[PDB]
Design a protein around this ligand. Structure first.
Ligand SMILES: [Mg+2]
Ligand SMILES: [Mg+2]
Ligand SMILES: [Mg+2]
Ligand SMILES: [Mg+2]
Ligand SMILES: [Mg+2]
Ligand SMILES: [Mg+2]
Ligand SMILES: [Mg+2]
Ligand SMILES: [Mg+2]
Ligand SMILES: [Mg+2]
Ligand SMILES: [Mg+2]
Ligand SMILES: [Mg+2]
Ligand SMILES: [Mg+2]
Ligand SMILES: [Mg+2]
Ligand SMILES: [Zn+2]
Lengths: 155, 60, 25, 92, 206, 118
RNA sequence: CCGGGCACUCUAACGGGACUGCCCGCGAAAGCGGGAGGAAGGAGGGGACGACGUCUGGUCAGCAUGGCCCUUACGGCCUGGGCGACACACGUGCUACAAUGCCCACUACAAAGCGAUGCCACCCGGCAACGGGGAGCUAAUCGCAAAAAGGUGGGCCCAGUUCGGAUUGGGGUCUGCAACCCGACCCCAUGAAGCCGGAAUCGCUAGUAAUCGCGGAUCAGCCAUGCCGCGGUGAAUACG
RNA sequence: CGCGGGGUGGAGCAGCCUGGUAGCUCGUCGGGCUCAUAACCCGAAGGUCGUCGGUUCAAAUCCGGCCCCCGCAACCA
RNA sequence: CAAGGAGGUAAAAAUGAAAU
C-alpha cells in the first residue's frame, strides 16, 4: 500500500561526459549485468556519430531523447471493471524512462548487423524526429489524443 | 527386513562394494554422515541434547 | 554451447577435460 | 465382475488371497463386499443396508462407495456390469 | 506449534555441553559411539538414582564420567558395592581409564530431568495427571524457582483420545538467550501406550 | 567442386566446406587439408585445380564416407536383425537404444506426441 | 628467495562504536520531517529465534510405542530380475533457437570449503579420457584450481547456418567380482527439434533481479542439469 | 399396396438441382480457470453420404432395382 | 469554523463434497 513514496534512485556519472543521463542509457543497453560491453557499445556508437555527421554525440543523444518524450500517455482507470482509459500527463521521471527504453528497443529492432551502428543510427534518426522510437512516441500520443472524451475524469 | 538388515551393514564381507553405511543409533541407510556414523535424524536429536562435542547451531 | 562435448565451454560445464580443453599448458 | 484395482491391498486380497494388505479384523468384511461387487450385474444389487451405497460428487463424479466399516470406503466405478478402479480409501 | 530444543538453542552461551572432548576424523565416530554406549549402559542400572546429567570428558585414554544425581544413595561407602565392579564394568568394551565420579544434585525440584521423571513415574502409577502436573509445578515453584512449565501430551488417563495437559506458573521466556532454562523429558510407558512429559525450569541470568 | 558425392559449398572456407559431407565433420576436415597441405582459409571457389585434385584424391579415398558408409552404418544396425540382441529390439520398436528414460521424453526417436486420453 | 623487520594486509580473541543522544521545525506526549556529526545511522544490511492455538494436517517405512495379525511362515539366506518398464498427461528444471553471438589462441582478477585406508605438484606415454612414474602435504606450509563472465588478437556474416546440440554407428578409458537390462567420461562420424513460444502462469524493490563460474555433503563409481553454500559483473521501476 | 418427400460424423441439420471443395451447432477427446463442479477460454480428432447396380475420366451429387422413415390419397355406388 | 435531514447505490458470476 506504498506507505513510503519510494525515493528516486540516483546514479553514478559516466566517464569523459558527466551526464546524469548517459549512464541510465548505458544501463538499458546492459544485459546480464555486463556494463563493460554496454558502455563500450554506446561510446562505440558515439564514435560512429562523428563519422556520418560532424556533431558532438552529447547533443545528438540529448536531442534524440528530447524528441522521444511522451507529453501525455493513456491510463486505464476506474468504474465498469476498469473500462475507461484516461489520458494522463507524463511525469518528468517517466518521460525520462520511456525515452531511453524505447530508444534501445527500437535500436535493436533495426535490421543492422552491429549493436553500435543500430544505436548510432537510431539516435541520429531520433534527433531528426524520424526514429522508430519517435514512431512509438507519436503513437502513444495518438492514443492519448483519441481519449480526450472522458479525459475530464482525470485524477 | 530391518533386524537382519542392520546385521549385514556391520557384517561387511563378500566383495568390497557390497558394504554400505548405516546409522548406528537408528538403522537408517539413507543420509548417513560418515563423520558421525549417524543419520541426519539422530544427528539433529543429539545436537540439541548437547551430546555432540563442539557441535553448535549455525547462524550467519 | 554449454552442452556440446567439443568446446572449452561445454567441457567446463561438464567439468571434465580433454582434447577440446587441455589440462593447462 | 471386478476388472481393475487402484488399491494394492484389496487387489491382492481378491486375487491371491493375501490379507496382509487390509486390516485383520476387516478381512471377512472386505471379502464379502468385493464378492458382492464382483457378482453385481448392476449397481442396484450393491444396495444392501449395510453397505450404505452412494455415488460421489464433484471431481469424484462417476464413482461409487460402499462402506466397509468406520470411516473406510471401497470406492469404484461401475459401468456395464463391471467395477473398475477398486480403491480402499478413508473417506478423507 | 514447532519450537526449538531450548538446550540446543543455548549450547554456546548459557548451558554448556554434556560430552566435552576434542578429536579429528577417524576417531570422532568411534569415540562418540563408545560415549553414547556409556550413556546407554549407565541409564539402565542407575535410574533408581535418578540422574540429572551424565557429563563426559576425555584426554587420550582418560575418559572421565560425572554422574549427577539427586540422591546418590546407590553408591554406598567404598567397598559396600554399588560402585566397585559397577564403575569397572564400563571397561569391558573400553579398557580405558574409567574415572567415574558422583555429584550431589542439591534440589531435585530445580532439576528439569528429575521433575519430568517424577511426573512420568506418576503417570505409570495411574495418577490423576492434571493434578500431578499442578503439584509438580508448584513443587518446583516452592523451591525458589523463577518460573516453571510442565507438559504431558497424548492418551491422558488412557481413554481413546489424545490430549495435552498444560500448566505453568511464573515466568518462562523461551525466546530469550540469557535464559538459564533447564529442559527435561521422559517417556511414560503405559499398558495403553506412550506419552511424553516436558519440563521447563527457569532462573534469572544477565 | 564435386569432391566426394557432393559439390555444393562454394565461397565458404575449405575447412568448413569439407564439413558438408557425411563422413567429414570437423576433425577429419583440418586433418585432411594439413595432410594434403592446403590452406584452410581459402575461398573454396574453384581455386588451384591441383589442390582440388589432391584433396579429392586423398579425401574420397583413405576412409569411407557419403552413401557408402551410410550403407555400412545401416548394415551395422541390420546386424541386429536375424535373431539379434536387446539393442536390436530397440531399433525394432523405434525406441531409444541406450537404456534411458522413456516414461517422458524420448521424442527424438518416438516422434511427435500422439495423445491417448483416458 | 634470503638477511632482518612485522608498521600495512590478513588471521581470530576480547573490545570500542549512536542511544535520533546534538541543531532547526512540528507536538500535550509518544513521535515525525529536516540538518552539519561520522564508516555507519530514527529497528544500518542480513541470520538464529515461530505466541494461545488451527488444520481428526504429516510421519507406525528414521526411531519409540497401545491394539490386531504372521510364525517350518507376512520371518531368514542367496543368484537373477524389478524400482530405469512407455500410446500418453502434469510439476520443477537443464541446454537452446544466436552477432550486446559462436569458435580458437593469449592473458588477468575471487571467496567459501575439502583432502596423507586421500588431495595428488612435476616429468613420461597418449589426439584425448587416462595410464606409468613420482616430490611435497598429519596441511593460513603441499595439493585440489587454471576461477568463469572479463580483456587482447584472429576467424565466421546472419543462412537451420562455425547457431543448436538431440539421436544413432564405430573406437576407447576408469570405477567395480561384474557395468545387457542400468554407470560416468574420452575420440571419430552423424548432426535432429527448435528461428523465441496458445489459453494461461512464476519470480524478484539494492549486491537485490539477471548473468558468470567455484566449493561441499552423500559418494568405489554415478545417471547432480538436484540440494546446501561461495564469491565475480551488476540493471529496471514503484505515480499510486 | 396408389402418388409425393426423405436416409450424410455420436445428436440435429446443410451441401445434391448448375458432378471434381462434404460444412454448421451440440457432443466427444486434450490443455487451461477454481479448493472442487458447472459456466467460461485455448487446441484438436471424428462421416462406408441407406444399400445393390449403371452412366462417366470422375458420383453424396445424375439414372435404375430393391430396404426402411414420414406425409397425402383411397371417391360414385 | 462543527452536519442534521433529503437522493442517485454493486456487477456477470450458479452449485457442494461424500461417519456423528
Ligand atoms: Mg530405461
Ligand atoms: Mg509437453
Ligand atoms: Mg525476538
Ligand atoms: Mg488424517
Ligand atoms: Mg514400526
Ligand atoms: Mg523411483
Ligand atoms: Mg524446422
Ligand atoms: Mg534466424
Ligand atoms: Mg520486499
Ligand atoms: Mg475438457
Ligand atoms: Mg469447471
Ligand atoms: Mg361426388
Ligand atoms: Mg443443481
Ligand atoms: Zn538413525
Amino acid at each position: 500500500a506504498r506507505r513510503r513514496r519510494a525515493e528516486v534512485r540516483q546514479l553514478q556519472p559516466d566517464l569523459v561526459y558527466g551526464d546524469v543521463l548517459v549512464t541510465a542509457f548505458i544501463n538499458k543497453i546492459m544485459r546480464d549485468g555486463k556494463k563493460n560491453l554496454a558502455a563500450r557499445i554506446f561510446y562505440d556508437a558515439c564514435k560512429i556519430i562523428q563519422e556520418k555527421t560532424g556533431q558532438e554525440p552529447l547533443k545528438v543523444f540529448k536531442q534524440a531523447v528530447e524528441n522521444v518524450k511522451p507529453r501525455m500517455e493513456v491510463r486505464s482507470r476506474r468504474v465498469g471493471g476498469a473500462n475507461y482509459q484516461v489520458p494522463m500527463e507524463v511525469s518528468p521521471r517517466r518521460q525520462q524512462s520511456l525515452a531511453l527504453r524505447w530508444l534501445v528497443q527500437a535500436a535493436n529492432q533495426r535490421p543492422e548487423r552491429r549493436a553500435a551502428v543500430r544505436i548510432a543510427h537510431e539516435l541520429m534518426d531520433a534527433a531528426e524526429g524520424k526514429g522508430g522510437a519517435v514512431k512509438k512516441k507519436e503513437d502513444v500520443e495518438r492514443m492519448a489524443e483519441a481519449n480526450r472524451a472522458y479525459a475530464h475524469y482525470r485524477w | 527386513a530391518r533386524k537382519a538388515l542392520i546385521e549385514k551393514a556391520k557384517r561387511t564381507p563378500k566383495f568390497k562394494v557390497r558394504a554400505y553405511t548405516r546409522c548406528v543409533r537408528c538403522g537408517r541407510a539413507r543420509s548417513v554422515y560418515r563423520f558421525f556414523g549417524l543419520c541426519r535424524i539422530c544427528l539433529r536429536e543429539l545436537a540439541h541434547k548437547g551430546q555432540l562435542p563442539g557441535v553448535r547451531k549455525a547462524s550467519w | 554451447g554449454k552442452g556440446d562435448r567439443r568446446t572449452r565451454r561445454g567441457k567446463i560445464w561438464r567439468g571434465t577435460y580433454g582434447k577440446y580443453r587441455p589440462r593447462k599448458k | 465382475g471386478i476388472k481393475s484395482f487402484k488399491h494394492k491391498g484389496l487387489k491382492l486380497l481378491f486375487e491371491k488371497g493375501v490379507t496382509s494388505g487390509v486390516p485383520a479384523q476387516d478381512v471377512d468384511r472386505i471379502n464379502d463386499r468385493l464378492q458382492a461387487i464382483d457378482t453385481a450385474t448392476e449397481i442396484g444389487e450393491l444396495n444392501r443396508q449395510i453397505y450404505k451405497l452412494h455415488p460421489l460428487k464433484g471431481d469424484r463424479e462417476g464413482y461409487w462407495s460402499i462402506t466397509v466399516r468406520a470411516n473406510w470406503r471401497i470406492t469404484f466405478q461401475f459401468i456395464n456390469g463391471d467395477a473398475y478402479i477398486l480403491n480402499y480409501e478413508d473417506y478423507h | 506449534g514447532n519450537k526449538i530444543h531450548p538446550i540446543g538453542f543455548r549450547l554456546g552461551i548459557t548451558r554448556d555441553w554434556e560430552s566435552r572432548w576434542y578429536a579429528g576424523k577417524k576417531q570422532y565416530r568411534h569415540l562418540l559411539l563408545e560415549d553414547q554406549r556409556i550413556r546407554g549402559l549407565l541409564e539402565k542400572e542407575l535410574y533408581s538414582a535418578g540422574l540429572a546429567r551424565v557429563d563426559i570428558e576425555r584426554a587420550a585414554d582418560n575418559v572421565a564420567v560425572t554422574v549427577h544425581v539427586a540422591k546418590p544413595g546407590v553408591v554406598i561407602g567404598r567397598g559396600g558395592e554399588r560402585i566397585r565392579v559397577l564403575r569397572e564394568e564400563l571397561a569391558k568394551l573400553t579398557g580405558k581409564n574409567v574415572a567415574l565420579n558422583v555429584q550431589e544434585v542439591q534440589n531435585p525440584n530445580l532439576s528439569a530431568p528429575l521433575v519430568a521423571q517424577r511426573v512420568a513415574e506418576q503417570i505409570e502409577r495411574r495418577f490423576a495427571v492434571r493434578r500431578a502436573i499442578k503439584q509438580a509445578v508448584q513443587r518446583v515453584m516452592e523451591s525458589g524457582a523463577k518460573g516453571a512449565k510442565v507438559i504431558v501430551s497424548g492418551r491422558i488417563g488412557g481413554a481413546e483420545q489424545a490430549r495435552t495437559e498444560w500448566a505453568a506458573q511464573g515466568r518462562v521466556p523461551l525466546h530469550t538467550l540469557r535464559a538459564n532454562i533447564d529442559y527435561g523429558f521422559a517417556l511414560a510407558r503405559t499398558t495403553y501406550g506412550v506419552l511424553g512429559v516436558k519440563a521447563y525450569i527457569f532462573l534469572g541470568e544477565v | 567442386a564435386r569432391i566426394a558425392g557432393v559439390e555444393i559449398p562454394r565461397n565458404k572456407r575449405v575447412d568448413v566446406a569439407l564439413t558438408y559431407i557425411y563422413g567429414i565433420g570437423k576433425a577429419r576436415a583440418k586433418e585432411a587439408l594439413e595432410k594434403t597441405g592446403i590452406n584452410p582459409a581459402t575461398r573454396v571457389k574453384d581455386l588451384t585445380e591441383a589442390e582440388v585434385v589432391r584433396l579429392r584424391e586423398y579425401v574420397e579415398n583413405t576412409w569411407k564416407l557419403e552413401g557408402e558408409l551410410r550403407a555400412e552404418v545401416a548394415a551395422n544396425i541390420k546386424r541386429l536383425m536375424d535373431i539379434g540382441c536387446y539393442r536390436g529390439l530397440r531399433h525394432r520398436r523405434g525406441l531409444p537404444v541406450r537404456g534411458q528414460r522413456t516414461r517422458t521424453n524420448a521424442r527424438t526417436r518416438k516422434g511427435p506426441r500422439k495423445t491417448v486420453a483416458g
